[PDB]
Design a binder for this molecule. Structure first.
Ligand SMILES: [Zn+2]
Lengths: 51, 302
C-alpha cells in the first residue's frame, strides 16, 4: 500500500478553511489492492469540506 | 419504520414501497435507472392526473451520501405528502395542479458506503481509470458550465467533476427522465449543512434573469420555515452565498427551462455538521416542509 502523504492539488476546504489535506490509502479488495482518497482533518479529526 | 431515526438504503426503499401500497391512487414507486454498482434508483411519483404538458416539480435528495439529514427529510416528506393529501388544502391544491417527483436517495452507492466504510463519503463509487481514487462529485457532473471554475480535475478530490458531463449513471438517469418527461417547473435539491436557501448561479456571478423573483420566493420560504422553531436561513445565489460550483444540478435545471430551481442546505450551522443527531430529523423535516410548500404554492400560482 502507498505511504500516506500530503495532498497534491488539494484545492480549498470551504467549510473548514484551515483544515489539513492528506492523501490516505488503505488496502482493499479491488484491482489496485488498495483505495486512496483525500482526507481533511481539523485538530486531528476528520471533516468534510463541501456541502 | 421510525421516522426519527436514520436508516439503511434497504429500509428506506421498503418504506417507499409501503407508502405507494398505502396510497395506490396517489403514489407509485418508479425505477428510473440504476447506480454504478447496480442498485435501483427509486423515485416516488405523487400525482392526481395525467397530461401531455402536465407540470411537475422534482424534489432531489441525498446526491451527497454523507448528508444524512437530506435522505431522512426526504422519506419523512414522502409520508407527509400522502398523510396530508385531502386534509391540508395547500398540498391538495398543489397536487391537483402538478405532479411531484421525489428522489430520496440520489446516490445509493455512496449511501451504503457511509454505513459500511466511511461516514463522510460524498461522491459516487465509480471507477477512475489509472487512479486508486474512487468516485466523482455527482453535483459537479451536470451539463452546466461543466468543468468550469468551481470543481476539480483530480479524481481524488471531493469535487471531482468526472471525465465528461453526465458520466455518472446516477445523474444521467435523472437528466434522461426529466428531459423525456418534460414540463418540469421546479427543481429543489436538498443538501446539508449551513442553513442556506439558494438559487442559480453557482458557475458564474452573472445574475439569473429571474433572480428578483427567486430571491423573493426564497425569502418567503425561509420565513415559513422559521415559523416552526425559529430556524434562520440565509438566502442568495449559490456562487456568492456558499462558494463557486460548476456543473451543479439546479444550474442545469434552470438553464434547461426549469424556472423554480433552488438548493436547500439543511441544518445545522457547524456544531454537528454532517453528523446531525437523529433527534433533529423530525424538527428539520417539519420546518423544511413549510419551506417546500411555499415554493410549490408559488409554482402553482404562476
Ligand atoms: Zn451536498
Amino acid at each position: 500500500v502507498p505511504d500516506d502523504r500530503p495532498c497534491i492539488n488539494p484545492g480549498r476546504c470551504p467549510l473548514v478553511p484551515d483544515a489539513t489535506c492528506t492523501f490516505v490509502c488503505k488496502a482493499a479488495d479491488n484491482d489496485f489492492g488498495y483505495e486512496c482518497q483525500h482526507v481533511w482533518t481539523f485538530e486531528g479529526q476528520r471533516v468534510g469540506c463541501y456541502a | 419504520f421510525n421516522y426519527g431515526a436514520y436508516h439503511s438504503l434497504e429500509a428506506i426503499y421498503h418504506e417507499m414501497d409501503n407508502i405507494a401500497a398505502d396510497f395506490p391512487d396517489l403514489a407509485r414507486r418508479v425505477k428510473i435507472g440504476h447506480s454504478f454498482e447496480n442498485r435501483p434508483m427509486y423515485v416516488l411519483k405523487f400525482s392526481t392526473g395525467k397530461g401531455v404538458r402536465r407540470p411537475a416539480v422534482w424534489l432531489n435528495a441525498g446526491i451527497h451520501s454523507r448528508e444524512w439529514i437530506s435522505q431522512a427529510t426526504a422519506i419523512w416528506t414522502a409520508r407527509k405528502i400522502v398523510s396530508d393529501y385531502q386534509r391540508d388544502p395547500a398540498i391538495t391544491s398543489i397536487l391537483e395542479k402538478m405532479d411531484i417527483f421525489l428522489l430520496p436517495v440520489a446516490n445509493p452507492d455512496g449511501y451504503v458506503y457511509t454505513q459500511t466504510q466511511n461516514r463522510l463519503w460524498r461522491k459516487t463509487r465509480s471507477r477512475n481509470p489509472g487512479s486508486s481514487c474512487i468516485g466523482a462529485d455527482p453535483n459537479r457532473n451536470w451539463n452546466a458550465s461543466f468543468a468550469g471554475k468551481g470543481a476539480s480535475d483530480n479524481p481524488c478530490s471531493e469535487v471531482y467533476h468526472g471525465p465528461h458531463a453526465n458520466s455518472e449513471v446516477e445523474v444521467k438517469s435523472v437528466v434522461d427522465f426529466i428531459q423525456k418527461h418534460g414540463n418540469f417547473k421546479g427543481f429543489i435539491d436538498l443538501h446539508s449543512y449551513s442553513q442556506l436557501l439558494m438559487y442559480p448561479y453557482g458557475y458564474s456571478v452573472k445574475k439569473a434573469p429571474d433572480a428578483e423573483e427567486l430571491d423573493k420566493v426564497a425569502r418567503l420560504a425561509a420565513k415559513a420555515l422559521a415559523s416552526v422553531s425559529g430556524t434562520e436561513y440565509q438566502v442568495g445565489p449559490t456562487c456568492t452565498t456558499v462558494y463557486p460550483a460548476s456543473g451543479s444540478s439546479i444550474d442545469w435545471a434552470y438553464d434547461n427551462g426549469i424556472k423554480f430551481a433552488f438548493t436547500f442546505e439543511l441544518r445545522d450551522t457547524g456544531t454537528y455538521g454532517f453528523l446531525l443527531p437523529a433527534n433533529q430529523i423530525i424538527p428539520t423535516a417539519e420546518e423544511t416542509w413549510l419551506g417546500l410548500k411555499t415554493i410549490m404554492e408559488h409554482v402553482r400560482d404562476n
